[PDB]
């Protein structure tokens, strides 16, 4: 009710090119809300309303950038990176079950591709996903709160999608190196995991060391000697 109004408005904010940063910001706000409630299509619908050129557009209204606008952009890219991660997983998944030599060939392409989209989000450049790169922005506690929650909401999920993808296709050594990734002090992905999820993660990797031992390799997938 209060939400349907805002998104109906995105259509008007996208009208005037001179107010393109505002579209971007207000578009981000909604999707931050959607994604907070796991509503991936809800968010994807708002997304497609952004003119897919709106960023080159903003850069042209400057060429002289405001923190808030610099962030709206990074955040918009984040939210994109995140939707692509899920759509490619859907695609990959479909294919892992179609089961009709061009097939496997396309399968490795998908596996290799979703792997990348996942890592894109997990190790999002220069700060990480839903993390502002600009501190001089005007105080906004609601946004800051929301962004901190999305890292807790969406980040661990992708970690598990990622393990699956890797295990599902025998990349078991890489599965165990998720341990490297999550505990890395570079990103501290670990401090957005609940103890419940860290356990879940640990137990999934066990399944992966069993599969490695099953091949005459050590639990981490290395040779014995």
């Amino acid at each position: 009710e209060e939400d349907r109004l805002k998104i109906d408005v995105i259509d008007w904010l996208v009208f005037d090119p001179a107010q393109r940063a505002e579209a971007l910001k207000q578009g981000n706000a909604i999707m931050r809300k959607f994604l907070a409630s796991k509503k991936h299509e809800a968010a994807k619908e708002v997304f497609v309303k952004i003119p897919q050129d709106s960023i080159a557009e903003i850069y042209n209204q400057c060429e002289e950038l405001p923190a808030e606008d610099d962030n709206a952009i990074r955040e918009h890219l984040c939210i994109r990176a995140y939707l692509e991660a899920h759509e490619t997983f859907n695609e990959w998944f479909k294919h892992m079950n179609s089961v009709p030599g061009s097939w496997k060939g396309h399968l490795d392409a998908l596996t290799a591709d979703v792997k990348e989209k996942m890592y894109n989000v997990l190790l999002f450049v220069d700060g990480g996903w839903m993390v502002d790169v600009r501190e001089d922005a005007k105080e906004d506690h609601e946004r800051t709160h929301q962004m901190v929650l999305l890292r807790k909401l969406c980040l661990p999920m992708l970690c598990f999608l990622l393990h699956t993808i890797l295990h599902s296709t025998g990349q078991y050594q890489e599965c165990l190196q998720l341990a490297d990734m999550v505990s890395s002090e570079r990103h501290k992905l670990y401090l957005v995991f609940s103890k419940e999820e860290l356990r879940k993660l640990l137990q999934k990797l066990r399944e992966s060391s069993l599969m490695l031992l099953d091949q005459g390799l050590d639990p981490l997938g290395y040779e014995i000697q």
Binding site: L176, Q177, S183, L202, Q203, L205, R206, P219, Y222
Partner: protein, 184 residues
Amino acid sequence: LSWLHEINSQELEKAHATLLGLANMETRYFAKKKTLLGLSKLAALASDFSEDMLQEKIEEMAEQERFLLHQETLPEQLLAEKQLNLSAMPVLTAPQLIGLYICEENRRANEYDFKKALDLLEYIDENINDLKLEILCKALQRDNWVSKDSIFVKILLPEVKDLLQADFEFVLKANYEYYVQGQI
């Protein structure tokens, strides 16, 4: 290899324990060491350790993670050139890593690389001053006397040498003068 079982049993204080131990004996594969330690740290985090006992453990692993950072951050080209398995080489020692960070073969070497090499002295564990020199001299050579300057501004001192270092001297003293005003 009890850690595998200690996990399925939810004995994570214990799986962290064996895991941390294996992590220390690891010398054959850096990548294996890395993983085991990451694994060790996850176990600790996901266990029921005391809020301080925990912060005490993640305290000391941040310390080891601080050392593997040096070998971790070895230039991919330097590696591509010594033709070393991206991730199948062994856990090097500090002597070895300085050789690399100091290796003339490392072209793109700048203050950071030499910086890294210097901090590595503290990880030697029993002549340290000789290296300290060898690594310092080699920073100027790449600068063709910028960088030896920058390495000093970063350290921001009586450990460095002057008269004995020299053992074109015009600028050496110039900096060994700007150093006076700096250290004092």
